[PDB]
């Protein structure tokens, strides 16, 4: 064994945006880039939909592709233009994957992403 | 979330993460450092980061990142790095050392982007 533990620290510090959700899409768990790329916080990102990121302006299509490989239990992969807390916008490229249980059933999904934006 | 869901996290991010040894010898790499660098699953257990090493890199800049991590801090910056099939890539590193509770390196961690376009 590698510890086990590093791995969540690994994550926590990654320099790109992740997060962690239940089959819902609502948040499980999220690391400090997501805080800083998305402007929400610690404690008040816990338990919100991935939808808070959404300028209600993706296309309904651009989610449903994504959805559509999440119910194949694949991983999607596309950009879309998200909303940060303070309302300013970015091009997100956004990796969405499936977890998977020995038995091959989803059981969380990972939401990664980069802010494309150069300022 | 269990451990396995953040060695799942690290496994499937879109960014190449290595953990290795405290002489740089790889001990673990996600799917995206083998797909950028080369070295599959097996034999990127059998390698060292050195195998990444090439000319076009100056030599301080392993100095740079090596005198960092000795002192139990992380050094960031740009090198060059060489695939398994022998073709060169920009990549934007990050090494940091991975602490026990008592503040001492178990391992070192790298994660690093490939800037390619033409590969
Ligand atoms: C891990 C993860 C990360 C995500 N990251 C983002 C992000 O960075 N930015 C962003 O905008 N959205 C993201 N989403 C998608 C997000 O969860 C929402 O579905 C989306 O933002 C649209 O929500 P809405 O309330 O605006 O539209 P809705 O009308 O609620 O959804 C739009 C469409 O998405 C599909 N859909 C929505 N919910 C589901 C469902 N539970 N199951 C199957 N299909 C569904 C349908 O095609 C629906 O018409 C992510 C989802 C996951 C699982
Ligand atoms: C986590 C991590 C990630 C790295 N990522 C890259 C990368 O992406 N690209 C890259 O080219 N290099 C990377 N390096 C640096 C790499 O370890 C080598 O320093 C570099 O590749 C030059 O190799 P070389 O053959 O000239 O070996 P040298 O640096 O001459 O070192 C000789 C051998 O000893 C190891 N080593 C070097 N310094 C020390 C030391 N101070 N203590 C013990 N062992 C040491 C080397 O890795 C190598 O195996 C990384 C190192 C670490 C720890």
Known sequence: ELLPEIFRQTVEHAPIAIS?????????????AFRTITGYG???????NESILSNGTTPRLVYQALWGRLAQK????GVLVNRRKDKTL??????????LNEAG???????????????
């Open 20 to 32: 962690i959700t239940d089959l819902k899409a609502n948040i499980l768990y999220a690391n400090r």
């Open 42 to 48: 610690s404690e008040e990102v816990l338990g919100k």
């Open 74 to 77: 694949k991983p999607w992969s």
């Open 90 to 99: 970015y091009l997100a490229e956004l990796t969405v994957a499936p977890v």
């Open 105 to 119: 059933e989803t059981i969380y999904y990972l939401g990664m992403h980069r802010d494309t934006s150069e300022l």
